[PDB]
Design a protein around this motif. Structure first.
Motif, PDB file in Angstrom:
ATOM      1  N   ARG B 117       0.862  -1.180   0.000  1.00  0.00           N
ATOM      2  CA  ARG B 117       0.000   0.000   0.000  1.00  0.00           C
ATOM      3  C   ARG B 117       0.899   1.232   0.000  1.00  0.00           C
ATOM      4  NH1 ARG B 117      -4.466  -1.194   4.609  1.00  0.00           N
ATOM      5  NH2 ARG B 117      -2.435  -1.262   5.665  1.00  0.00           N
ATOM      6  N   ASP B 120      -1.742   7.044  -2.525  1.00  0.00           N
ATOM      7  CA  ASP B 120      -3.176   7.027  -2.784  1.00  0.00           C
ATOM      8  C   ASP B 120      -3.590   5.709  -3.428  1.00  0.00           C
ATOM      9  OD1 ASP B 120      -5.832   7.825  -3.069  1.00  0.00           O
ATOM     10  OD2 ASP B 120      -5.452   8.803  -4.998  1.00  0.00           O
ATOM     11  N   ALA B 121      -4.668   5.116  -2.911  1.00  0.00           N
ATOM     12  CA  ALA B 121      -5.161   3.856  -3.453  1.00  0.00           C
ATOM     13  C   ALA B 121      -5.840   4.043  -4.803  1.00  0.00           C
ATOM     14  CB  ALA B 121      -6.140   3.207  -2.473  1.00  0.00           C
ATOM     15  N   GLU B 122      -6.270   5.260  -5.130  1.00  0.00           N
ATOM     16  CA  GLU B 122      -6.929   5.543  -6.396  1.00  0.00           C
ATOM     17  C   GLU B 122      -6.018   6.254  -7.389  1.00  0.00           C
ATOM     18  OE1 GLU B 122      -9.815   4.800  -7.823  1.00  0.00           O
ATOM     19  OE2 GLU B 122     -10.363   3.469  -6.164  1.00  0.00           O
ATOM     20  N   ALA B 123      -4.745   6.442  -7.045  1.00  0.00           N
ATOM     21  CA  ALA B 123      -3.786   7.023  -7.974  1.00  0.00           C
ATOM     22  C   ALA B 123      -3.284   5.969  -8.952  1.00  0.00           C
ATOM     23  CB  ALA B 123      -2.612   7.633  -7.208  1.00  0.00           C
ATOM     24  N   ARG B 124      -3.298   6.331 -10.232  1.00  0.00           N
ATOM     25  CA  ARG B 124      -2.930   5.359 -11.285  1.00  0.00           C
ATOM     26  C   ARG B 124      -1.416   5.290 -11.438  1.00  0.00           C
ATOM     27  NH1 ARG B 124      -4.599   5.455 -16.359  1.00  0.00           N
ATOM     28  NH2 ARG B 124      -5.633   3.466 -16.803  1.00  0.00           N
ATOM     29  N   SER B 156      -4.892   1.661 -10.980  1.00  0.00           N
ATOM     30  CA  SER B 156      -4.758   2.100  -9.601  1.00  0.00           C
ATOM     31  C   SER B 156      -4.672   0.895  -8.672  1.00  0.00           C
ATOM     32  CB  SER B 156      -5.937   2.990  -9.197  1.00  0.00           C
ATOM     33  OG  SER B 156      -6.967   2.227  -8.593  1.00  0.00           O
ATOM     34  N   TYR B 157      -4.210   1.124  -7.462  1.00  0.00           N
ATOM     35  CA  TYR B 157      -4.119   0.078  -6.501  1.00  0.00           C
ATOM     36  C   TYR B 157      -5.473  -0.526  -6.254  1.00  0.00           C
ATOM     37  CZ  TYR B 157      -3.866  -2.157  -2.011  1.00  0.00           C
ATOM     38  OH  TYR B 157      -3.950  -3.027  -0.990  1.00  0.00           O
ATOM     39  N   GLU B 158      -6.523   0.275  -6.186  1.00  0.00           N
ATOM     40  CA  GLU B 158      -7.869  -0.246  -5.965  1.00  0.00           C
ATOM     41  C   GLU B 158      -8.288  -1.188  -7.087  1.00  0.00           C
ATOM     42  OE1 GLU B 158      -8.933   0.727  -2.954  1.00  0.00           O
ATOM     43  OE2 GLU B 158     -10.356  -0.929  -3.193  1.00  0.00           O
ATOM     44  N   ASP B 159      -7.927  -0.859  -8.330  1.00  0.00           N
ATOM     45  CA  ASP B 159      -8.238  -1.744  -9.447  1.00  0.00           C
ATOM     46  C   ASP B 159      -7.486  -3.064  -9.339  1.00  0.00           C
ATOM     47  OD1 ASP B 159      -9.792   0.378 -10.612  1.00  0.00           O
ATOM     48  OD2 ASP B 159      -7.921   1.234 -11.382  1.00  0.00           O
ATOM     49  N   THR B 161      -6.599  -4.576  -6.538  1.00  0.00           N
ATOM     50  CA  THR B 161      -6.852  -5.351  -5.353  1.00  0.00           C
ATOM     51  C   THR B 161      -7.543  -6.640  -5.669  1.00  0.00           C
ATOM     52  OG1 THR B 161      -8.855  -4.117  -5.184  1.00  0.00           O
ATOM     53  CG2 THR B 161      -7.104  -3.504  -3.769  1.00  0.00           C
TER      54      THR B 161
END
Ligand SMILES: [Zn+2]
Ligand SMILES: [Zn+2]
Lengths: 522, 524
Positions: B117, B120-124, B156-159, B161
């Motif tokens: 992690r 930002d989790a939504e940063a590409r 992004s990190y969220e994508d 996960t």
């Protein structure tokens, strides 16, 4: 009395537990003591893996003396009925070379590893051992019978410590050799694909049973995983192998071919030493020849190329030349065994001697052009020994060799008794290989490896020698050492000798070059 | 910036560890905090499985606030170079239905389960992930690319996960469908042999691709992995992971495969859009119920399921729906229940039973017209038209298509779904080989209000004379546990008693209530 055993394999997340239920008749209702299984193969505290130990149908169970003992109360009629679950740790047992070997899809236990200790171990009883509720798709293999679903054995507990019970689902192959059954099992992670292990094992066994020309009614070969080792234990009706994942094909082939050969040589062809003489007298034959044959077996089965066969005998010449006891006579080797100063170098001396003698004898027998060979002569030696319990007196053994035009008695008295150097004929590796002179640097560490280790301080560092040349000086706080044991299985010649002091020092063991006739290609 | 990952699967005695080396550049030399992976799939304290965490090539690391953090000391230029080893316990992880799945010859991790992690989790970012020094003979897979040795994703990190990385040595099969690659992986102990699993998966996967006859993904993986007591699956783009128990029966898995992997197509590329303001559950009878029907038709067509077993599945539906307390509830009542978080197993299962029986009826009615029509032909047309609007059809367009083929779809929707009217299945719906006959089935009646009872901690609603009363249970008994009590969870057996441990005594009885007559299909 009769002892009834029922064993259930229960696959788990990281292992396979063994639910064991046992029933027998005691004399009366006097509360007796029973002991949990103790590992004869080295695991410390095998009782810790017994998850539960409770009675069945009315038989009561209380705590005994220690954690390896249980007090059970038989029924008024004398029935005893117990149930216990063996949950072996796969992580902890990866360090015990011959301990229990379990996994999410397999299990293996030696007799001592799951059998209960009750009463006298020398006492004979009728053991009925069954495997029940085995998982779907699994194949079983027991050393007491060809059908692990139910075996019937009359023996003592001591006799059963070396037996085996196992199963798996990771690789099975079955074939018939001369109408007899042979089963192969492979579980655990291994680089060598399952099909290459089955084909190789199939060829090695089929060759072994051909040599001596009908054997065991059932035989199993079980391959199980253990890091950092390539070892095996041999038994009647089974060969168990614990090997690391990164095992090379030839490493396993040489072990399969050598440990299974021990069932014949010296299992059915033993040379009796004279009265009072030790068993080591014929280690050159019972160990050195077995290795020679094992090598000749792989090359016949087209598993080992002849170029590697040359490097195996070249290593024997290099290893024996670096052996400090290479010229020691019988009176000296036997005196070191009574004096207990019998290191790895002494353990390997007869392997290097016997393997090269067999290579010379074969070359000398095959040069006769009469169809003779060291193998044809060993079949005659083994067939003759069948009328004497597989043993042969020294005179009878050497009489045979002399009949085939081979000076067997003279070679043994020369090289084994008197320690004279061994000469290998130049045509031993075929016409495609020829022995040419080569200089190999001798093993000289430049310091006394044992006096240092004993005093934990560098002692006897020879000035100008390799250790001196690295900066090391006598009387230094020896911390540790790596790759310094010349005759232990993992010594590498291309790797430096490491030694740590108070700082890590590394240098190669350079010494007075010697010349050896190593076999080269054309 | 660029994040560069290197993952080494290191086999061990009971597991397979993951040596992860990551290289990325920080904005400055100033120390920063990085935090170990947290599981989005439900593993408590996943950081506990991080064995080591060190810097590489001069970068220094130190402790941080909590155990989840680490203080990383970048280089003067900003270079960050870390190496950490994940060693997952296979024992404890058997209890986490979607946790990391490792063991002596395989591994599977979700994106969140191995990635770090950072920021930002939504940063590409541009994620380059490679698997190095993999063990000999292992086959690997990734959801971010057809070649697991190196994938490259800008996300992004969220994508990431929900991405997947894994491999194994216990079974592999590859095949091609219309020029596209499919790989199958099986690891762990399973009663069904690998050949049977591979043949079924290849049949089911091929059937699903011909059904819509569209070009599937360039690469697709199916990973079977072991876990006790569950038979579950997570569908992703480019991969379908299935965690199942060793004792799983073939049909149990075949239904799970055919159903879950059909959701890529229905509603994935064919969703009925509800009117404005309406919940997305409105068409759960079409997006869940019809999918179950087509999954069963798929299995029978691939000869993985006999026609006698198909009749039983629909008999099961009739019985389960007849036992459903919400069977006659209108859509306003069922929409009232979602807003009050009362959606229980009975509610989530109501649309399954409803939609599957309607599909069976609709197919009988369509084929009864004798014009070559069928429900499968109809769904091919609907899917084709939806491709022009985004896999999405308005309610009017959807129903206009059915009415064009002589089927009164709309009528049934506002009669069985909106009004909750009882569903009738045409008697010929299972072919001439089966006939519906009246059978008497005892209704599910525990003699006690379970929901009320579990809301409190005493026995609530025991009816004097009900099955619970005759078993010895009464009003106001400290309620402790229950077994075989949830009727609409998959595991309920009408042949096993309902177990209720009170106080602590164990009461076991049968929840047999007033008889009910239903027309079940029987062989002729
Ligand atoms: Zn040996
Ligand atoms: Zn679904």
């Amino acid at each position: 009395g009769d002892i009834h055993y029922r064993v259930k394999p229960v696959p788990a997340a990281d292992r396979t537990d063994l639910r064991v239920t046992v029933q027998f008749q005691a004399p009366d209702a006097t509360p007796l003591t029973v002991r949990l299984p103790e590992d004869c193969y080295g695991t410390p505290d095998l009782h810790q893996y017994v998850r539960s130990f409770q009675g069945m149908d009315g038989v009561k169970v209380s705590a005994g003396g220690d954690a390896r003992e249980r007090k059970v109360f038989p029924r008024p009629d004398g029935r005893v009925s117990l149930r216990y679950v063996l949950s072996f740790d796969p992580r902890g047992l990866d360090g015990v070379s011959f301990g229990p070997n379990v996994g999410p899809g397999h299990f293996h236990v030696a007799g001592c590893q799951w059998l209960l200790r009750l009463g006298d171990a020398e006492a004979r009883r009728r053991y009925v051992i069954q495997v029940e509720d085995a998982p779907a798709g699994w194949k079983l293999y027991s050393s007491l019978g060809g059908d692990a679903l139910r075996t019937e054995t009359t023996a003592s507990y001591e006799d059963l410590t070396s037996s085996a019970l196992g199963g798996g689902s990771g690789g099975f192959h079955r074939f018939e050799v001369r109408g007899k059954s042979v089963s192969l099992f492979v579980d655990g992670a291994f680089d060598v694909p399952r099909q290459q292990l089955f084909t190789a094992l199939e060829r090695i066994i089929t060759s072994q049973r051909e040599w001596f020309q009908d054997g065991p009614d059932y035989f199993h070969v079980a391959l199980r995983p253990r890091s950092g080792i390539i070892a095996g234990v041999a038994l009647d009706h089974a060969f168990i192998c614990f090997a690391k994942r990164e095992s090379r094909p030839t490493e396993l082939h040489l072990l399969f071919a050598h440990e299974m050969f021990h069932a014949w040589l010296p299992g059915k062809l033993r040379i009796e030493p004279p009265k009072g003489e030790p068993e080591l007298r014929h280690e050159w034959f019972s160990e050195g020849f077995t290795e020679y044959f094992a090598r000749r077996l792989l090359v016949d089965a087209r598993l080992l190329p002849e170029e590697a066969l040359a490097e195996l005998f070249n290593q024997d010449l290099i290893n024996l030349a670096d052996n400090p006891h290479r010229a020691e006579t019988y009176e000296q080797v036997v005196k070191a065994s009574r004096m207990q100063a019998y290191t790895s170098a002494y353990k390997k001396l007869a392997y290097y001697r016997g393997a090269l003698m067999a290579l010379d004898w074969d070359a000398r027998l095959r040069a006769q052009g009469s169809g003779a060979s060291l193998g044809k002569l060993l079949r005659e030696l083994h067939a003759l020994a069948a009328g004497r319990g597989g043993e042969l007196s020294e005179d009878a053994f050497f009489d045979v060799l002399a009949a085939h035009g081979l000076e067997g008695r003279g070679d043994f008295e020369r090289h084994i008794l008197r320690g004279e150097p061994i000469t290998v004929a130049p045509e031993a590796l075929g016409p495609a290989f020829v022995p040419r002179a080569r200089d190999v640097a001798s093993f000289d560490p430049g310091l006394s490896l044992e006096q240092t280790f004993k005093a934990r301080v560098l002692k006897g560092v020879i000035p100008g020698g390799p250790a001196y040349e690295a900066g090391l000086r006598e009387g230094m706080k020896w911390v540790s050492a790596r790759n310094s044991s010349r005759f232990v299985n993992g010594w590498r010649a291309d790797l430096p000798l490491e030694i740590i002091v108070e700082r890590r020092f590394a240098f190669f063991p350079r010494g007075p070059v010697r010349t050896l006739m190593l076999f080269q290609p054309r």
